[PDB]
Scaffold this active site. Structure first.
Site, PDB file in Angstrom:
ATOM      1  N   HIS A  82      36.938  60.302  10.103  1.00 38.35           N
ATOM      2  CA  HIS A  82      37.225  61.901  10.394  1.00 38.35           C
ATOM      3  C   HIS A  82      38.740  62.033  10.445  1.00 38.35           C
ATOM      4  O   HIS A  82      39.495  61.201  10.245  1.00 38.35           O
ATOM      5  CB  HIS A  82      36.842  61.593  11.976  1.00 38.35           C
ATOM      6  CG  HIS A  82      35.708  61.605  12.619  1.00 38.35           C
ATOM      7  ND1 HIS A  82      34.968  62.186  13.474  1.00 38.35           N
ATOM      8  CD2 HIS A  82      34.553  60.864  11.957  1.00 38.35           C
ATOM      9  CE1 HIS A  82      33.649  61.595  13.703  1.00 38.35           C
ATOM     10  NE2 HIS A  82      33.476  60.994  12.583  1.00 38.35           N
TER      11      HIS A  82
HETATM   12  C1  LIG Z   1      39.536  52.030  12.954  1.00 37.27           C
HETATM   13  C2  LIG Z   1      39.644  53.298  11.606  1.00 37.27           C
HETATM   14  C3  LIG Z   1      40.011  54.624  11.862  1.00 37.27           C
HETATM   15  C4  LIG Z   1      41.041  52.647  10.985  1.00 37.27           C
HETATM   16  O1  LIG Z   1      42.172  52.713  11.691  1.00 37.27           O
HETATM   17  P1  LIG Z   1      43.627  53.723  11.030  1.00 37.27           P
HETATM   18  O2  LIG Z   1      44.030  54.584  11.862  1.00 37.27           O
HETATM   19  O3  LIG Z   1      42.972  54.160   9.860  1.00 37.27           O
HETATM   20  O4  LIG Z   1      44.567  52.359  10.907  1.00 37.27           O
HETATM   21  P2  LIG Z   1      44.863  51.304   9.623  1.00 37.27           P
HETATM   22  O5  LIG Z   1      43.573  50.436   9.430  1.00 37.27           O
HETATM   23  O6  LIG Z   1      45.235  51.725   8.217  1.00 37.27           O
HETATM   24  O7  LIG Z   1      46.071  50.190  10.306  1.00 37.27           O
HETATM   25  C5  LIG Z   1      45.841  50.102  11.610  1.00 37.27           C
HETATM   26  C6  LIG Z   1      45.928  48.322  11.877  1.00 37.27           C
HETATM   27  O8  LIG Z   1      44.518  48.087  12.455  1.00 37.27           O
HETATM   28  C7  LIG Z   1      43.853  46.922  11.781  1.00 37.27           C
HETATM   29  N1  LIG Z   1      42.488  47.464  11.869  1.00 37.27           N
HETATM   30  C8  LIG Z   1      41.613  48.323  11.446  1.00 37.27           C
HETATM   31  N2  LIG Z   1      40.617  48.327  11.855  1.00 37.27           N
HETATM   32  C9  LIG Z   1      40.446  47.233  12.774  1.00 37.27           C
HETATM   33  C10 LIG Z   1      39.640  46.522  13.608  1.00 37.27           C
HETATM   34  N3  LIG Z   1      38.343  46.940  13.823  1.00 37.27           N
HETATM   35  N4  LIG Z   1      40.165  45.665  14.393  1.00 37.27           N
HETATM   36  C11 LIG Z   1      41.427  45.269  14.506  1.00 37.27           C
HETATM   37  N5  LIG Z   1      42.162  45.793  13.629  1.00 37.27           N
HETATM   38  C12 LIG Z   1      41.700  46.658  13.045  1.00 37.27           C
HETATM   39  C13 LIG Z   1      44.346  47.259  10.338  1.00 37.27           C
HETATM   40  O9  LIG Z   1      43.983  45.965   9.755  1.00 37.27           O
HETATM   41  C14 LIG Z   1      45.776  47.803  10.429  1.00 37.27           C
HETATM   42  O10 LIG Z   1      46.583  46.354  10.379  1.00 37.27           O
HETATM   43  P3  LIG Z   1      48.215  46.366  10.514  1.00 37.27           P
HETATM   44  O11 LIG Z   1      48.832  46.984  11.749  1.00 37.27           O
HETATM   45  O12 LIG Z   1      48.696  45.156  10.355  1.00 37.27           O
HETATM   46  O13 LIG Z   1      48.716  47.217   9.196  1.00 37.27           O
HETATM   47  C15 LIG Z   1      38.658  52.887  10.947  1.00 37.27           C
HETATM   48  O14 LIG Z   1      38.325  51.414  10.476  1.00 37.27           O
HETATM   49  C16 LIG Z   1      37.231  52.905  11.676  1.00 37.27           C
HETATM   50  O15 LIG Z   1      36.729  52.283  12.502  1.00 37.27           O
HETATM   51  N6  LIG Z   1      36.410  54.176  11.146  1.00 37.27           N
HETATM   52  C17 LIG Z   1      35.224  54.340  11.983  1.00 37.27           C
HETATM   53  C18 LIG Z   1      34.181  54.461  10.951  1.00 37.27           C
HETATM   54  C19 LIG Z   1      32.742  54.800  11.522  1.00 37.27           C
HETATM   55  O16 LIG Z   1      31.909  53.797  11.962  1.00 37.27           O
HETATM   56  N7  LIG Z   1      32.194  55.943  11.467  1.00 37.27           N
HETATM   57  C20 LIG Z   1      31.007  56.456  11.969  1.00 37.27           C
HETATM   58  C21 LIG Z   1      31.068  57.618  12.654  1.00 37.27           C
HETATM   59  S1  LIG Z   1      29.983  59.187  12.013  1.00 37.27           S
HETATM   60  C1  LIG Z   2      30.905  61.576   9.724  1.00 35.89           C
HETATM   61  C2  LIG Z   2      30.814  62.865  10.192  1.00 35.89           C
HETATM   62  C3  LIG Z   2      29.878  63.378  10.892  1.00 35.89           C
HETATM   63  C4  LIG Z   2      28.660  62.529  11.300  1.00 35.89           C
HETATM   64  O1  LIG Z   2      28.825  61.946  12.685  1.00 35.89           O
HETATM   65  C5  LIG Z   2      27.335  63.610  11.327  1.00 35.89           C
HETATM   66  C6  LIG Z   2      26.131  62.903  10.463  1.00 35.89           C
HETATM   67  O2  LIG Z   2      26.047  61.746  10.071  1.00 35.89           O
HETATM   68  C7  LIG Z   2      25.251  63.858  10.057  1.00 35.89           C
HETATM   69  C8  LIG Z   2      25.799  64.715   8.953  1.00 35.89           C
HETATM   70  N1  LIG Z   2      27.071  65.074   8.481  1.00 35.89           N
HETATM   71  C9  LIG Z   2      26.889  65.731   7.398  1.00 35.89           C
HETATM   72  C10 LIG Z   2      25.575  66.229   7.054  1.00 35.89           C
HETATM   73  O3  LIG Z   2      24.734  65.494   8.089  1.00 35.89           O
HETATM   74  C11 LIG Z   2      27.877  66.280   6.374  1.00 35.89           C
HETATM   75  O4  LIG Z   2      27.601  67.385   5.994  1.00 35.89           O
HETATM   76  N2  LIG Z   2      28.956  65.657   6.214  1.00 35.89           N
HETATM   77  C12 LIG Z   2      28.999  63.919   6.588  1.00 35.89           C
HETATM   78  C13 LIG Z   2      30.260  63.436   5.735  1.00 35.89           C
HETATM   79  C14 LIG Z   2      30.948  64.907   5.314  1.00 35.89           C
HETATM   80  C15 LIG Z   2      30.118  65.773   5.569  1.00 35.89           C
HETATM   81  C16 LIG Z   2      30.812  67.287   5.180  1.00 35.89           C
HETATM   82  O5  LIG Z   2      30.498  68.259   5.658  1.00 35.89           O
HETATM   83  O6  LIG Z   2      31.389  67.072   4.055  1.00 35.89           O
HETATM   84  C17 LIG Z   2      32.236  68.118   3.625  1.00 35.89           C
HETATM   85  C18 LIG Z   2      32.042  68.104   2.199  1.00 35.89           C
HETATM   86  C19 LIG Z   2      30.361  68.486   2.269  1.00 35.89           C
HETATM   87  C20 LIG Z   2      32.690  69.290   1.584  1.00 35.89           C
HETATM   88  C21 LIG Z   2      33.702  67.754   3.871  1.00 35.89           C
HETATM   89  C22 LIG Z   2      34.334  66.964   2.798  1.00 35.89           C
HETATM   90  C23 LIG Z   2      34.062  67.237   5.393  1.00 35.89           C
HETATM   91  C24 LIG Z   2      33.684  66.220   5.910  1.00 35.89           C
HETATM   92  C25 LIG Z   2      34.314  65.859   7.178  1.00 35.89           C
HETATM   93  O7  LIG Z   2      34.542  66.891   8.164  1.00 35.89           O
HETATM   94  N3  LIG Z   2      33.949  64.998   7.384  1.00 35.89           N
HETATM   95  C26 LIG Z   2      34.129  64.021   8.634  1.00 35.89           C
HETATM   96  C27 LIG Z   2      32.940  63.296   9.100  1.00 35.89           C
HETATM   97  C28 LIG Z   2      31.893  63.629   9.932  1.00 35.89           C
END
Ligand SMILES: CC(C)(COP(=O)(O)OP(=O)(O)OC[C@H]1O[C@@H](n2cnc3c(N)ncnc32)[C@H](O)[C@@H]1OP(=O)(O)O)[C@@H](O)C(=O)NCCC(=O)NCCS
Ligand SMILES: CC1=C\[C@@H](O)CC(=O)Cc2nc(co2)C(=O)N2CCC=C2C(=O)O[C@H](C(C)C)[C@H](C)/C=C/C(=O)NC\C=C\1
Ligand SMILES: CC(C)(COP(=O)(O)OP(=O)(O)OC[C@H]1O[C@@H](n2cnc3c(N)ncnc32)[C@H](O)[C@@H]1OP(=O)(O)O)[C@@H](O)C(=O)NCCC(=O)NCCS
Ligand SMILES: CC(C)(COP(=O)(O)OP(=O)(O)OC[C@H]1O[C@@H](n2cnc3c(N)ncnc32)[C@H](O)[C@@H]1OP(=O)(O)O)[C@@H](O)C(=O)NCCC(=O)NCCS
Ligand SMILES: CC1=C\[C@@H](O)CC(=O)Cc2nc(co2)C(=O)N2CCC=C2C(=O)O[C@H](C(C)C)[C@H](C)/C=C/C(=O)NC\C=C\1
Lengths: 205, 206, 206
Positions: A82
C-alpha cells in the site's frame, strides 16, 4: 537422457511433480529455468502460488535451473503493498467518489524484482516477500519467511529467515560459482551427475 | 476414574478431541503415552499430522504421557531431507535414465529420532522439525517452529523457536523431574490431581 | 461521498472485501471501528477469524477505524489458555470424575484485552496472541505472530514480531496522534483524503 523439460508432468501418471517452466511460460514477464520442479501440495499448479503479480506494475520473478521448490511455497509480488507516505488505508478502492484518490504508479512502493538462482532448494510452506534475491545453491528451511537476500550456497531459515551457516568452505563455493554446471549442455551434465551430487566435479572441470 | 485411554474419542458426542495412543498404536517406529490427546483442526486424525515417516529410514517418534497437542501441529520426520553433500536436486526421481542415481541409505542425512516428553503442551499450528527433543513440563507457544531441543519445564516460542523463560525455579524443576508423577499408577494420580495442578505435590512427596 | 460504513459488502460484485463493524457488531465483547475492512481469503466472514472468545472469561476485543485487514489474519483470545501454576493437562475436560478439578475463573491466565488502533494495516496470515495492543498507524508485516505490544506508527514483523523501524520522525508522529483525523466526521475527512494520504494534513490542521 533424462526427462523432457517441456512436459508439465515429467513422471507419467503423476500429477504431483511438475516442471515449472512449461507451466509459467505463457505468463508475461516471468522467467524459469529448465529442470526446476514443484512438488504440488494438493494437486494445484505452481501459477496459483505466485500472488499479487500485476503487469502494469512491471515487477519480475526469476527462477533459475535445477531448483526444487517444496509444496506450499508462496511467492508474493508487489501488487500487495500500500502507499505509506501517509495513511495506508486504500480509499481509492471503495469508489463512490473516492477513485479521485487513486495512487500514481511512482507513489506505490515497489521493492523490486524477485530472483531465485540455480540449484536452489526451498522447503515447504516458505513465503517469499517482494524484491528478494536467492543465490545459487542456497537452501531455505521449511516454513521460513524471506524478507531479504540470501547469499549463494547458504542455509537460511526462520521468520524472518536469516543465514545460518555456509554449506561449504569458501574455496568450494568460489569454484562452484565458477564452474556453473547448471549452464553446461545437458549431455555433458548427463555424464557427471555423479560428480555433481558429491561435489567432485570441482576437480574434474 | 477418568476417561478410558483406549478410546479414540474420550469425550462423548465429541469427535474432535481424540486420544493419540489408540490411533498411532498400529504404527511402526512410533510410541505414544497413555493420556496424551490431540484437538483436531478439521476433524483429521493425528496420524495425518505426521509427515515423511518411512520405516526404511528407521527414525522413531516418541510422545510421553499427559500431553496436550493443539490443532494443526505438524511433525516432520526424516523422509523429506535431500542429499546435500553436493547438488540438492533429486535427479533419481525423474527416471529416463536418471533412475540409476538413487542415493545410498547412508548418503541421506538422518537427524535422529523425535522425542516429546511428558506433560508437554504444544500450541496450535506448531511445526516440529526432525531429530528434536522437548523435555517434560515444557510449553511451546502457538505457531512455533522447533528446530533444536527444548529443556524441561521451559517456555519456548518463535520461528526458530527459542527458550524464552523457565516455568519454575531450578529447585522445583529438579524436584518435579525427579518425582515423575506421570509415571505413577492412576489410583494415586487420581487422588492427587489437585496437587499436580498447583504444584504442591512436591511438598507432599519430599 | 464514499461507501456507507454500514454496508457489509461495500464494493460491488465483490463478496471478498467486507466492512467489519456490521458483521462483528452482533458479537458480545467486541468493539469495531467504522471503515476498517477485511479482505476475505476464501469467502469466510471475519467473525470466523476470532478464535477462543468465550464471554465467561470477559476479555474484550477492540478495533479502531480505517484499518486494512489482510486475508487470513487470525485473532487468538484468552479462551485457549491452559492453567499453569502446575500441570497443564486439562483433566477437567475429560469428565468421568475429573470434572471436580474444573479451574476457578481466578486460576486461568487472562492476559487482558486485545486492542488494535486506528489506521492500522495488518498483513496477511498474521496471528495475534491474546492481550496485545497495537498502535495507531502501525504496519504489521504479513505472516507475523504478534506476542508483545506494538507502538504507534511503528513497522513490525517476524515470529515473534519485533518493532523494525519507525514510519516517520517523532515530531510527525506526535502530531498525527494529536490530530486524530480518523475521529472527524466523514464530511470533513472527505475533503482532506489527499492531505491525509501524503501526511500534509499536519501543516493544515495544526
Ligand atoms: C512490511 C513491509 C511493508 C516492508 O517494510 P518496508 O517499509 O518496505 O521496509 P524494508 O523491507 O524495505 O526494510 C525494513 C527492514 O525490515 C526488514 N523486514 C521486512 N519485513 C520484515 C519482517 N516480516 N520481519 C522482520 N524484518 C522485516 C527488512 O529486511 C529491512 O531490513 P534492514 O532494516 O536491515 O534494511 C512488507 O513486507 C509487508 O509486510 N507488506 C504487506 C503485504 C500483505 O500481506 N498485504 C496484504 C494486504 S491487502
Ligand atoms: C491490496 C489492496 C487492497 C486489497 O486489500 C483489497 C482487495 O484485495 C480486493 C481488490 N482490490 C482490487 C480489486 O479487488 C483492486 O482494484 N486493486 C488490488 C490491487 C490494485 C488494485 C487497484 O485498484 O490497482 C490500481 C490499478 C488497477 C490502476 C492502482 C495501480 C492501485 C493500486 C492501489 O492503491 N493498490 C494498493 C493495494 C490495495
Ligand atoms: C534446513 C534443514 C535442511 C536442516 O539443515 P541441516 O544441514 O541438516 O543442519 P542442521 O539441522 O543441523 O541445522 C544447524 C543449525 O541450524 C538451525 N536450524 C535448522 N533449521 C532452522 C530454521 N528454519 N531456522 C533457524 N535455524 C534453523 C538449527 O537449530 C541449528 O542450530 P545450531 O547450529 O546453533 O546448533 C531442514 O531443517 C529443512 O528445512 N529441510 C526441508 C524440509 C522440506 O520442507 N522439504 C520439502 C521439499 S522435498
Ligand atoms: C506461550 C503462552 C502460553 C504464553 O506464556 P505465558 O506464561 O503467558 O508468557 P507471557 O505472556 O508472560 O510472555 C512471556 C515472554 O515470552 C514472549 N513470548 C510469548 N509468546 C512468544 C512466542 N511465540 N515467541 C517468542 N516469545 C514469545 C513474550 O513476548 C514475553 O516477553 P518478555 O519476557 O520480555 O516479557 C501463549 O502465548 C500460547 O502459546 N498459548 C497456546 C494457545 C494454543 O494454541 N492453544 C491450543 C491447545 S489447548
Ligand atoms: C483450550 C483448552 C483446551 C482445548 O484443548 C480443548 C478443546 O478445544 C475442546 C473443548 N473444550 C471444551 C469443550 O471442548 C471446553 O469445555 N473448554 C474449551 C474452552 C474452555 C473449556 C472449559 O472447560 O470450559 C469451562 C467452562 C464451561 C466453565 C472452564 C471455564 C475451563 C476451561 C479450561 O480449563 N479452559 C482452558 C482451555 C483449555
Amino acid at each position: 537422457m533424462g526427462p523432457n523439460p517441456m512436459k508439465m508432468y515429467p513422471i507419467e501418471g503423476n500429477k504431483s511433480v511438475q516442471f515449472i517452466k512449461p507451466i509459467l511460460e505463457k505468463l508475461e514477464n516471468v522467467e524459469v529455468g529448465e529442470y526446476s520442479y514443484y512438488d504440488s501440495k494438493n494437486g494445484e499448479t505452481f501459477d496459483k502460488q505466485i500472488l499479487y503479480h500485476y503487469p502494469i506494475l512491471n515487477d519480475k520473478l526469476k527462477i533459475g535451473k535445477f531448483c526444487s521448490i517444496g509444496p506450499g511455497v508462496t511467492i508474493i509480488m508487489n501488487g500487495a503493498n500500500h502507499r505509506m507516505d501517509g495513511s495506508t488505508y486504500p480509499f481509492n478502492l471503495f469508489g463512490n467518489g473516492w477513485e479521485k484518490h487513486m495512487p500514481k504508479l511512482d507513489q506505490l512502493p515497489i521493492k523490486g524484482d524477485t530472483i531465485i538462482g540455480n540449484d536452489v532448494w526451498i522447503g515447504k510452506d516458505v513465503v517469499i516477500m517482494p524484491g528478494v534475491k536467492i543465490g545459487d545453491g542456497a537452501i531455505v528451511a521449511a516454513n521460513s519467511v524471506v524478507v531479504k537476500d540470501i547469499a549463494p550456497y547458504m542455509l537460511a531459515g526462520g521468520n524472518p529467515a536469516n543465514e545460518i551457516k555456509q554449506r561449504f568452505d569458501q574455496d568450494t563455493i568460489n569454484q562452484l560459482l565458477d564452474i556453473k554446471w547448471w549452464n553446461w549442455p545437458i549431455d555433458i551434465i548427463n555424464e557427471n551427475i555423479d560428480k555433481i551430487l558429491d561435489n567432485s566435479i570441482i576437480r574434474e572441470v
